[PDB]
Structures are given as structure tokens and as C-alpha cells.
Amino acid sequence: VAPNGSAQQLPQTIIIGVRKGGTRALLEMLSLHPDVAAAENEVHFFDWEEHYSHGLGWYLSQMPFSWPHQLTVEKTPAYFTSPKVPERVYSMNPSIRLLLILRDPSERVLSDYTQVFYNHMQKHKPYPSIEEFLVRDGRLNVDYKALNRSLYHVHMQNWLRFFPLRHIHIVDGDRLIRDPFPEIQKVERFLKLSPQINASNFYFNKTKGFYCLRDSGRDRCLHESKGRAHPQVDPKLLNKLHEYFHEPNKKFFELVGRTFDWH
Numbered sequence: 691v692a693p694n695g696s697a698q699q700l701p702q703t704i705i706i707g708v709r710k711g712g713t714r715a716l717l718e719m720l721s722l723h724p725d726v727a728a729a730e731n732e733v734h735f736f737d738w739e740e741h742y743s744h745g746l747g748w749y750l751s752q753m754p755f756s757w758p759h760q761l762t763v764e765k766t767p768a769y770f771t772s773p774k775v776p777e778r779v780y781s782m783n784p785s786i787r788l789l790l791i792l793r794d795p796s797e798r799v800l801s802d803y804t805q806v807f808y809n810h811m812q813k814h815k816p817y818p819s820i821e822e823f824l825v826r827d828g829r830l831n832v833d834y835k836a837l838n839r840s841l842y843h844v845h846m847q848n849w850l851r852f853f854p855l856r857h858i859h860i861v862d863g864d865r866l867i868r869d870p871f872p873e874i875q876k877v878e879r880f881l882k883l884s885p886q887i888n889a890s891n892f893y894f895n896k897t898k899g900f901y902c903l904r905d906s907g908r909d910r911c912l913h914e915s916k917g918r919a920h921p922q923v924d925p926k927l928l929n930k931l932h933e934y935f936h937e938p939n940k941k942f943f944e945l946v947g948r949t950f951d952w953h
């Protein structure tokens with residue numbers, strides 16, 4: 691307990707993923723709420739053995755300082771798709787409320803590729819073409835790992851072994867892109883937070899091509915790495931990608947009791 695009365699608290703909510711779902715947008719928008727304290731970086735507690743072995747005292751020490759009635763949140767997108775994670779989250783807090791943000795599974799693949807491609811292009815390293823990952827022996831490459839991260843039903847089933855359905859709120863990442871404020875209202879509702887966030891905290895930035903955030907005189911967009919142009923992909927290949935996900939999408943829809951407007 692600091693002189694100002696603040697203290698580090700374990701998170702009362704965690705944004706677990708998906709990788710490229712819009713996790714940083716969700717983290718920054720939720721942290722507009724005066725009752726929310728966000729960790730600025732991805733903590734990687736549950737998913738890295740070298741962090742997790744340090745235990746809960748180490749986790750707590752990575753949290754922002756907050757006041758007792760505030761909710762602390764952390765985002766690490768690797769959580770969702772790491773098999774050992776939900777069991778570790780459950781032994782910290784079986785009752786925790788979790789945030790999962792999902793985009794269209796094909797758009798998420800192209801986003802994931804784009805990000806690693808861009809990490810390479812600036813370090814002046816080579817990177818294969820997306821067709822090199824996506825196509826093997828004239829067929830869609832089902833062993834491309836990005837595709838597995840988009841099989842949401844598989845990862846969701848692993849969380850549902852430990853957490854009840856009603857304690858994982860699914861943010862529609864496609865809708866957050868188009869019109870964030872209604873999705874953010876649902877998050878406040880899920881977390882039982884007063885409606886402090888306003889439509890006026892968001893504005894469309896034409897250069898960015900995405901909404902940016904407005905809060906008591908300060909204007910901020912997400913950084914360079916967020917909202918990057920995906921590669922051009924032949925329509926025939928884009929179509930096969932879309933088709934690949936149709937059946938796993940239906941399995942996901944049946945598991946969570948709702949549908950999403952995906953390709």
C-alpha cells in the first residue's frame with residue numbers, strides 16, 4: 691500500500707486473446723473507464739514457464755497500482771491458444787471473468803501473417819509469401835499454424851473445461867472495428883461497471899482508417915503495428931480459406947450459443 695492509498699491487485703479480468711482479434715484496441719478502450727487499471731504490456735504469466743515459476747507474487751508485481759474498488763486487467767493474446775493456461779488461471783481464481791475478442795477467422799489469419807511479415811520487412815529479413823504458407827501441393831495447407839489459431843472451437847473447448855460459458859464474454863472484433871462503442875458497452879455490462887464510457891470517447895481517423903480514442907483533451911490512435919494492410923490474395927485462394935472455416939465456425943457457434951457474421 692503506497693502513501694497515495696494505491697496497491698497492486700491481481701487482475702479481476704483478463705483479455706486472453708485471440709492473437710490479432712483486436713486485444714490492444716479492447717485493452718485501451720476498456721481502460722478509458724475510470725474504475726479500470728490496465729497493465730500496459732503483455733504480461734505472459736501463465737504461458738511462459740520462466741514467468742509462471744516465479745508465482746503469484748511475481749504476477750502481482752507486474753500489475754498497475756490501483757485503488758480497492760478498481761478492476762485490474764491484463765492482456766496476453768497467447769493465453770487463449772496455449773493448452774496449459776486455463777488450468778493455471780483456474781487455480782489463481784475459478785471465478786474470474788474473462789474477455790475473448792474474435793475476428794472473422796480468415797481475416798485473423800491474414801492479420802497474423804501481416805504482422806510477422808512487417809516485423810521482418812523492417813529488420814530487413816526475408817519472409818515467405820502468404821501463398822507459401824497457405825498452399826501446399828496445390829491444396830490449402832492445413833498445417834499452417836495461423837489456421838489452427840483461427841479454429842476457435844478447439845481453443846474455446848479447452849477454456850470451457852475450467853470456466854463456465856457465462857464467465858467468458860466474447861467481443862465481436864469485426865463489430866469493434868466498424869463501431870466500437872456498442873461492443874464496449876457490452877463489456878462494461880458484463881463486468882458490472884457503470885456506463886462511464888461515451889460515444890464521444892471515440893472518433894474515426896481517416897488517415898488511420900480506424901477509430902481513435904479521445905479522453906479529457908488528449909487524442910490517441912493505436913500504434914503503427916495496429917491496422918496494417920493485408921496482402922492481396924487470389925480470390926480462389928481466399929475462397930478456399932473462407933470455406934475451410936465454415937464447419938469449425940458452425941461448431942464454435944453451437945458451443946457458445948450465438949453466431950457471428952463471418953465469411
Ligand SMILES: Nc1ncnc2c1ncn2[C@@H]1O[C@H](COP(=O)(O)O)[C@@H](OP(=O)(O)O)[C@H]1O
Nearest residue numbers: 710711712713714715801900901912916917918
Ligand atoms: N481502433 C483500432 N485501431 C487499430 N486497430 C484496431 C482497432 N480496433 C480493432 N483493431 C484491430 O486490432 C488488430 C490487432 O489486434 P491485436 O491488437 O490483438 O494484435 C488490427 O489488425 P490489423 O492490423 O490486421 O488490421 C485491427 O484490425
